[PDB]
Amino acid sequence: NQVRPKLPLLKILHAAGAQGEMFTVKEVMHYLGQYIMVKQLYDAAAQHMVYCGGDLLGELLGRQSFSVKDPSPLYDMLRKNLVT
């Protein structure tokens, strides 16, 4: 199946390599993990901790830090920003 990012979440995907308008959940996550690596938001020391606070992704998450080993705040955000 396929879903549509919102204008706040789509800007974040088109700044990683994505091109178009509509994607799959699974490739949303690919281009979403690309973002954290290109703009350098992850912790170099403990590479499970992302520091999205300063930038758009954080304002979208309602957080300023989150771990990749507990990513449920991604699935609070992945339901609120994708039209099924």
Binding site: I36, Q47, V68
Partner: peptide, 11 residues
């Protein structure tokens, strides 16, 4: 460690 495989448990 490595964000690469940490970000592959979710996906």
């Amino acid at each position: 460690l490595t964000f690469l495989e940490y970000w592959a448990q979710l996906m």
